[PDB]
UniProtKB/Swiss-Prot annotation:
The keyword Cell cycle does not apply. One of its GO terms (cellular component) is extracellular space. Synthesized in the acinar cells of the pancreas. PANTHER family: RIKEN CDNA 2210010C04 GENE, TRYPSIN-RELATED. Residues 1-221 form the Peptidase S1 domain. Substrate binds at residues 171-172, 174-175, 177. Ca(2+) binds at residues 52, 54, 57, 62. GO terms for biological process: digestion; proteolysis. SUPFAM superfamilies: Trypsin-like serine proteases (SSF50494). Subsequent cleavage after Lys-125 leads to alpha-trypsin. Further cleavage after Lys-170 yields pseudotrypsin. A cleavage may also occur after Arg-99. Not sulfated on tyrosine residue(s). It comes from Bos taurus. This is Serine protease 1. Pfam families: Trypsin. Its main location: secreted.
Amino acid sequence: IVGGYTCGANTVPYQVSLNSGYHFCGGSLINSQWVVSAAHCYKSGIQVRLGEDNINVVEGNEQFISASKSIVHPSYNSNTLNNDIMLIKLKSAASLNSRVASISLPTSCASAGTQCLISGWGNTKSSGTSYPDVLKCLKAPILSDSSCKSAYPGQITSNMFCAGYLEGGKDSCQGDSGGPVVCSGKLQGIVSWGSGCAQKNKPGVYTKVCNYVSWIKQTIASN
Ligand SMILES: [Ca+2]
């Protein structure tokens, strides 16, 4: 997260870190045994880390649970990043509490102008490289489809939306991938892509979660 703030320990209780020897992506806990992340975060040997603030220090509220399976969206295209969504099942159910909690799926899509919370352990520099140990947060509005398409001609599908600031300086970034965009207590987006980070006229692009609710529910129901 570039231009954000320190969230505070366990203030974003649905935020998970995906770890394969090291943090490589974010995710969102949507029930006791399932996480939603980006399809471009797919790999084998994933451990889901819940209850994290400082990802380098054991602080006492963590639960570390290996993934039993991952399910990348059947229509994910890694070139265009269309359908950039994946489900991860935990080997055992997380113990839910005030600091480890699921986030609700949308019942309807969020509109341009809606304020959302984006979070992660990604790079905090737009030019340099600096990875924080503690969770970073950014409040950012969803942008209009027209402004999103104008920013990224030929690249915005019906399964994507832009959020952030056309002026630059405030954005998600590398390492935030797969993490949540939560608006009015609903998971509306997944950190997917962007051209650099926090660059003028290049806002963050996010997977439009409301398009996948039926797939998520049906997949969970049979797996
Ligand atoms: Ca920790």
